[PDB]
Amino acid sequence: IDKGIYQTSNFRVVPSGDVVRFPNITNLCPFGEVFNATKFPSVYAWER
Amino acid sequence: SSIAYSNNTIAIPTNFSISITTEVMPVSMAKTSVDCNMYICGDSTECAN
Numbered sequence: 466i467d468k469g470i471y472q473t474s475n476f477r478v479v480p481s482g483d484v485v486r487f488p489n490i491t492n493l494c495p496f497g498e499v500f501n502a503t504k505f506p507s508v509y510a511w512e513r
Numbered sequence: 514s515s516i517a518y519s520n521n522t523i524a525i526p527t528n529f530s531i532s533i534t535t536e537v538m539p540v541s542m543a544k545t546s547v548d549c550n551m552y553i554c555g556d557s558t559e560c561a562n
């Protein structure tokens with residue numbers, strides 16, 4: 466190679482890490498009554 | 514205008530005026546380069562393939 470300045474590559478910085486952001490979340494579902502209400506129904510009284 | 518052509522008359526200046534006239538010329542452009550693999554693909558690896 467002769468004396469000079471030459472182009473050889475395009476360099477590019479890869480990321481160190483990853484960021485996820487979503488809304489200021491609210492409104493949980495009423496599921497806790499279905500599993501752990503104080504005494505479960507009979508098969509005729511049947512809460513849904 | 515009407516130059517009064519004459520068979521035997523000549524017009525000769527009795528006075529003179531110095532002048533300064535600007536002339537403007539371009540000489541160079543903005544030196545430019547393009548990372549074509551980034552321009553085409555935007556770091557999509559599959560486009561880069």
Ligand SMILES: *[C@@H]1O[C@H](CO)[C@@H](O)[C@H](O)[C@H]1NC(C)=O
Binds near residue numbers: 490
């Ligand atoms: C909602 O934003 C406020 C103010 O920054 C913060 O106090 C709260 O913890 C956030 N809640 C959630 C679910 O992100």
Ligand SMILES: *[C@@H]1O[C@H](CO)[C@@H](O)[C@H](O)[C@H]1NC(C)=O
Binds near residue numbers: 500501
């Ligand atoms: C109710 O609470 C107990 C706590 O030990 C848990 O084991 C049970 O699975 C809960 N749900 C039901 C359906 O009983």
Ligand SMILES: *[C@@H]1O[C@H](CO)[C@@H](O)[C@H](O)[C@H]1NC(C)=O
Binds near residue numbers: 527528529
């Ligand atoms: C030429 O014209 C200028 C105009 O300002 C005048 O001042 C001057 O006297 C003239 N010169 C001669 C030598 O006629």
